[PDB]
């Protein structure tokens, strides 16, 4: 079968190695119990990441047969840009959105790392994701899509691992007993996943709905909720050329990675894009997270402002509906499934291709900003857009008569069958349901 | 025919009378040219409205045969609450939404005023909406839905009116020549429509995309963009019972109108809910508006936060999709059409009925706020929600294999037909379209 | 845990007993190995069902502690009618649809049988569905929805059962060894599931795409594909009152069960509604089935013909879109989930409530029929429906100019960015994709 | 303005000339009153069309300054194929669909004829469509999309035309008085529009819902409802290669026009695809039509059978939903608008590109046929598709528990708020609405 319930002693095993305590201990344990682990680390432009070069070294020190560092930034940013172009975000609360940053990270990490392993000829793959979350499944699909022959081994799916190093304490103590002094004395009030597109905070104290963004130490921006933190208003311009972000505050860039890093700094100085979401997982249940994605948020606002001045109503509606559906597929680890590709490609080609122009914003604190100017050769919006006469409007209005008549007829029918208390004849038609009541 | 192209001399004519220069002059002119005008004014809880009682008096002074003041606040608020329960808003830019406040006002005004006129037996109806906008059509549909026998007369559809009193200057001069000293010396940088649910600002200087919220003097809140305006952070609680807003900051209310007035004050102190939208009209073209809806915004945020912790993914998705569609129908003057009623009723019954709970927010400036607590007997979200084992997850994952296999097969097929440069085998599948490029 | 991997020796176990070899052997085996099985059989109006009264008797003979026969026909038909009113069907090929008859049967069977067991105080539940199909999951959800305390035991989930009585031969031989002479000498070219709403045929020879309806012996109708079978044309009338089917060929009925039985006879004489579908299961993979549902098909055609003459475009579109989504949820065993109830209730209230009228058809062979008359007090369709003038049309057309202009502009932009070879200026705009080619 | 209310005496005027009495008389009248008419006729492969070469001759005889015959068959068939690939059909009744054949004809006719006129430098355009239908608007949009400078003149928009030649009798008498003996002694029981993709029949006696297909003399097939007409069963094969129809009954073709002509003959011998629809027009009201499209129907059935065996559930669902929306836009004369192109292109690229294979059918009378075989290198369907174990299924089922629990909770809540009479605890949950009742 594909999933190996227990350590395949003597076999080469590849593992997505982040350098954290989970994968550090798992690799040492895997080597200790007889397997031949290979470490694969992805450079994802993690905001707080000290030195990526060191991660492969610790893997070697802990027993990796070989350890590679794969740069995934170009690909991550390209997918992030695609997400922006498609409005591929679905978890929203009052207008604040989660920019699907971890899902984007897994789509690029889960495929590129497995591709890299093909050069080492290793055919057993795994990671350190818990068996209770979304990530173990995202990696699972992405990996098997990239390598069909792949077999799967994950410490959190092996009862022999969980019983021995199940707790963080057991993992620290294991490192110790193996001759390695690890440094995890610190246990925050939440766990953090991050990459160049954003940072996600959840678990521990964030599991409680009475906790708030106040306990979070943002790593991509400032604590805008802290009135003692100085944040001067800032004017910023964002310019797109055929759906592609090409300039921020008049500056252009050598590549998209640099552009995104700058979008992050700009939004970061204000705390732009931070949100608190209760969301539905891929599996049963719900989870709660607090997210950061300053650059994605900045690009998203400008892109949509331009979209509203360039495309027609039906096209804008498809962008919203298709974008939300795509956002869900991305979240489920299905970013490359046929239904996702179809929506993504269609939005990139017919919507994003016309998004050329520049938007000027004034950023203050958090999600408080104002739009100061919107410019584009492709606007269909025109001031004071003469074109038709009052007689023309008389004609148009008159041709609504039969539709109005039919609707009036339906109101009468709904009133008769009890769905409306009173039709339109006596004023406001009243829908007959529990919500039709005051306080 | 239904629409009378010219003044029906000698006939009773009802007119939606707001007291502005347009309807003041139109009624005087209608009486002057031989018609018998009746004025009907709606009390919509207009924020800046001096004294509604005076409007019917001026109508009488200008020639109205009779003048009535109809209170439409209870109905307006009830529809506003329904809108909140259904997320019936569709014009959004980066998460900021227009709360369809004018459309809600017209649905209640256009039906109630025509119903009232039935007591006076007047069968010719009109208003002072321009022939180039959305409102002339909203009033048209709502009126004909309420009274089938209705004939229609609108000064802005009568070439004899426009040629004589077409300009604001011609209207002031007309009042003057008729013995009335009007007071419109002031001509703002934009026009304003408002009611208890919100205020809309457009036209004139707002027609230009380089104008901003900075030229607007908000009438439902403060100028949060003005760093010189003091706005202390404020903690607020919003509580719902079966989809109905029943308490703000622990206070309950005698009726919904009072509740809404308080929601407005709370959001108003911060400038919550203000947005700048470029939108598609009912007819051809686009328009640009800057909107206020502090109470609607406050209720909307709390309602959706609760929704995310109470309902499942598919239900939340229907709320978004059906709400957006309903928002469009509301905007088009179709709030009581069968397709609208079906979506509204279904969301009120199955979604709103379970929205019971309380949300605590910390409001700062504009749309910058934080969520501090979310509580509800109906939450399906539970901290640390054991329930399944790693072996169970092995089973679940394994049963995805054939779907992954099929998707892998499609990637190969798309690569072969040229839609993807490279499948998943070599890393990240690359979609073949213009957007797949850097800067 | 909820699912017991092995026989709970000594415990009361309820089982959905159909009387087939699977459940006959499973109950005998369960009793033989020490459990205390209780049989629960549902009367579903199975077309070919000999005598339902005998099924509980054989259960007793094989070892059941107690055996009950629950009549589920009224409920089955009521849900079938709801399905018709909502167009809750999603598996279609060229217009021919699967009427979700097994899914409807499981929704009523899985809830009613578990409810019945509550009177016997039995808290372990199961059925004889294979672990590779949809039904084991439909029963699972429906059962747990009805009884939260329920524990689950299913022979096809017990490795101790499958290894002993895995094959049909092993089951026959087991009956024999236990002193019972069963009669299953016959093994068709496919398996059959049926109830009063329809019959489904799949597995065995139907697994092959080169097999056809030709190997099926229909149990609810005739072999219309057999030119040697005489099938005279027949005129039939179907009449609805507020969405409810109340008369067939002028005859009314004492209850819906009788009405459905007659719809079945009428459609049955022609083979109406039979289809061949390749469909996606709840889990991974696809299956192939050949279906019968003569009465459902007859009611479905008349209902939709009426719908098209009574409701407006947007309402009809919601019926199609919401009906398809509901059809999928019904198929997945989610007929009572909140997202399903919302769609079902909304369609019953706003669409079905107005479906009053009568349709006359001429039925020939299979799906070949003609519509001969459509009548309804609620039609909005009117012959030769004067109402507007050519001048009015000039106005309406003129007001499309700006939208046409904007679209023309987009064509130019798509041509420039390479999406169209040539805009509209040179004739037919050419979309740039692989499909734009001849043979 | 764009639309000229009266004959532009002395100016060159182009007119879509079909050769019927309407355009024959209009061109003679236009020339007689002083305009300089140019005739443009489209070769659309009309089934009953005698000799297209003669149409330009009669135009010349009646006064045309110049008369051209433009071949539009290749383009018409290419768009028809695109429609099939996208399932761009929306008017359906019980599974029978209108294949949008007139809308496809107008999209190609309205653009190509106007493009052709650019060579003659004529800038006034029109046609003979009535001011009360869909076509006058389809031609209007398509024409203005192709030529922005275009001015519009249509006899049915000119009160001076309608008053003089309003009736068919007045038109015959006009020809006569001008020295031309026309031949329209025959006035059928309905009017007919047709092209190579299909024939539409409406108006006159078809306006009555008690008329039926029985009064129609089909021009693309036989009277399958007439039991006296011999129609032997026929086996047919349809083969696609990358979404393109390439062989019928083993025969390939030099071009698509020939392929379509053959599809028509095959379906024609059986009357395949004929339907009776009540539909909503672009404007207010409904109309009734009886349609023929034998080849389109044949290709449509095979294409969808293949689609069901090749693509996954979500992709198939998008094909249905996007296809229906596209069908509506096509019907509205918006086949080249951005929202249409986006849906069409996305379906052609990601769905149609994989549709490779062959389907064998047995055609009998009308829409009575059977599927005999389905073959494809791209099928994801596999007979007897081992892959997972009962233990794996135990895991999968177990992971549904929390979702079931949440749904059970909602049932309890809906029961409490009165939406359900009884939850699931007592059997079948009962939705509280008018439809929950028997006969
Ligand atoms: N940069 C990276 N390169 C490779 N794999 C990574 C990277 N970041 C995360 N992963 C993989 O994703 C898994 C889930 O990420 P997460 O940050 O939640 O890890 P974790 O379970 O806390 O483990 P650790 O304590 O080792 O970080 C990790 O166990 C690891 O296998
Ligand atoms: N409170 C109200 N009661 C009745 N009718 C109203 C009310 N508010 C607005 N209307 C109607 O709606 C029309 C459009 O509103 P809007 O505020 O844009 O008016 P307007 O065209 O500027 O006219 P005026 O200058 O008279 O306000 C008004 O002409 C009037 O007929
Ligand atoms: N009328 C019924 N009453 C109760 N349970 C039923 C009924 N019909 C079917 N079932 C249940 O549904 C399961 C699946 O139905 P299906 O007809 O496929 O059965 P099966 O696996 O072939 O078993 P059998 O050989 O016993 O019919 C059956 O095993 C049985 O538990
Ligand atoms: N083959 C064609 N070539 C050019 N224009 C055409 C063609 N077929 C139809 N039309 C145009 O479409 C209009 C509407 O088509 P329809 O067949 O309904 O015509 P009609 O109004 O009955 O006129 P006629 O009596 O001249 O056919 C025609 O008046 C004509 O202008
Ligand atoms: N260890 C992990 O990487 N966790 C799996 C991702 C799931 C995510 N934390 C969630 O439950 O929302
Ligand atoms: N583990 C984390 O802290 N975050 C990773 C998952 C975040 C988010 N719920 C997601 O699944 O995308
Ligand atoms: N006079 C009015 O009331 N104007 C019509 C409403 C239309 C709105 N101002 C718009 O054009 O967006
Ligand atoms: N005239 C205004 O200032 N506002 C009224 C219309 C506002 C908004 N565009 C609407 O149509 O609802
Ligand atoms: N034994 C069964 O009842 N089978 C489970 C239902 C699944 C259905 N036969 C299918 O696989 O399509
Ligand atoms: N087992 C059968 O013969 N039919 C039952 C399932 C039929 C259909 N595929 C369904 O799952 O509803
Ligand atoms: N003369 C025409 O070509 N008629 C306009 C097309 C409209 C179509 N007959 C309809 O009303 O459905
Ligand atoms: N005029 C006809 O006989 N048919 C042309 C229109 C047919 C169909 N209602 C359509 O508008 O496409």
Which keywords apply here?
four-stranded antiparallel β-sheet; EC 6.3.4.5 (chains A, B, C, D); Arginosuc_syn_C (chains A, B, C, D); binds adenosine-5'-triphosphate; Argininosuccinate synthetase, chain A, domain 2; amino-acid biosynthesis (chains A, B, C, D); protein homodimerization activity (chains A, B, C, D); Rossmann fold; Helix Hairpins; alpha/beta; Arg_succ_synth_type2_subfam (chains A, B, C, D)
Summarize the structure.
Four copies of one chain form a homotetramer. The first copy, chain A, has helices at 21-32, 54-61, 73-86, 101-117, 135-146, 159-165, 168-177, 256-268, 294-310, 313-331, 338-350, 390-398, 401-416; strands at residues 12-16, 36-43, 67-71, 92-93, 96-97, 124-126, 151-152, 191-195, 198-202, 234-241, 244-248, 275-280, 286-292, 357-363, 369-375. Chain A has 439 residues and is of the alpha/beta class.
Break the fold down into its secondary structure elements and pairings.
Four copies of one chain form a homotetramer.
Chain A: E1 12-16, H1 21-32, E2 36-43, H2 54-61, E3 67-71, H3 73-86, E4 92-93, E5 96-97, H4 101-117, E6 124-126, H5 135-146, E7 151-152, H6 159-165, H7 168-177, E8 191-195, E9 198-202, E10 234-241, E11 244-248, H8 256-268, E12 275-280, E13 286-292, H9 294-310, H10 313-331, H11 338-350, E14 357-363, E15 369-375, H12 390-398, H13 401-416
Parallel strand pairs in A: 1-2, 1-6, 2-3, 6-7
Antiparallel strand pairs in A: 4-5, 8-9, 9-13, 10-11, 10-14, 12-13, 14-15
Bound molecules: adenosine-5'-triphosphate (4 copies) and citrulline (8 copies).
Residues 102-103, 134, 191-193, 200-202, 287, 289 of chain B line the site of one citrulline (CIR).
């Amino acid at each position: 079968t594909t999933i190996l319930k227990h350590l395949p002693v003597g076999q080469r095993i590849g593992i997505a190695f982040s350098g954290g305590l989970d994968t550090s201990a798992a690799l040492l344990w895997m080597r200790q119990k007889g397997a031949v682990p290979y470490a694969y680390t992805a450079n994802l432009g993690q905001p707080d990441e000290e030195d990526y070069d060191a991660i492969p070294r610790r893997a070697m020190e802990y027993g990796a047969e070989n350890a590679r560092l794969i740069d995934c930034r170009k690909q991550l940013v390209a997918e992030g840009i695609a997400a922006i172009q498609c409005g591929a975000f679905h978890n929203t609360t009052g207008g604040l959105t989660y920019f699907n940053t971890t899902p984007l990270g897994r789509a690029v990490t889960g495929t590129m790392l497995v591709a890299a392993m093909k050069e080492d000829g290793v055919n057993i793959w795994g990671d350190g994701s818990t068996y209770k979350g979304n990530d173990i499944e995202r990696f699972y699909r992405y990996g098997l899509l990239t390598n069909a022959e792949l077999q799967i081994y994950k410490p959190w799916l092996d009862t022999d691992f969980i019983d021995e190093l199940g707790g963080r304490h057991e993992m620290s103590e294991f490192m110790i007993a193996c001759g390695f002094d690890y440094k995890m004395s610190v246990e925050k009030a939440y766990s953090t996943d991050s990459n160049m597109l954003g940072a996600t905070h959840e678990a521990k104290d964030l599991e409680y709905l009475n906790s708030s963004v106040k306990i979070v130490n943002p790593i991509m921006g400032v604590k805008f909720w802290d009135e003692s933190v100085k944040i001067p208003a800032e004017e910023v311009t964002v310019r797109f050329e055929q759906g592609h972000p090409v300039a921020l505050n008049g500056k252009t860039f050598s590549d998209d990675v640099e552009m995104m890093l700058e979008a992050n700094r700009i939004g970061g100085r204000h705390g732009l894009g931070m949100s608190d979401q209760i969301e539905n997982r891929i599996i049963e249940a719900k989870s709660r997270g607090i997210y950061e994605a300053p650059g994605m948020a900045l690009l998203h606002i400008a892109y949509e402002r331009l979209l509203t001045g360039i495309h027609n109503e039906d096209t804008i509606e498809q962008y919203h509906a298709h974008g939300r559906q795509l956002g869900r597929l991305l979240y489920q680890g299905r970013w490359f499934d046929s239904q996702a590709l179809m929506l993504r490609d269609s939005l990139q080609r017919w919507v994003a291709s016309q998004i050329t122009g520049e938007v000027t914003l004034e950023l203050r604190r958090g999600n408080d900003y104002s739009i100061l100017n919107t410019v584009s050769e492709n606007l269909t919006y025109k001031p004071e857009r003469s074109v038709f006469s009052p007689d023309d409007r008389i004609g148009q209005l008159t041709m609504r008569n039969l539709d109005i008549t039919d609707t009036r007829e339906k109101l009468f029918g709904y009133a008769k069958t009890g769905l409306l208390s009173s039709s339109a004849a006596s004023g406001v038609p009243q829908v007959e349901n529990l919500e039709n009541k005051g306080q």
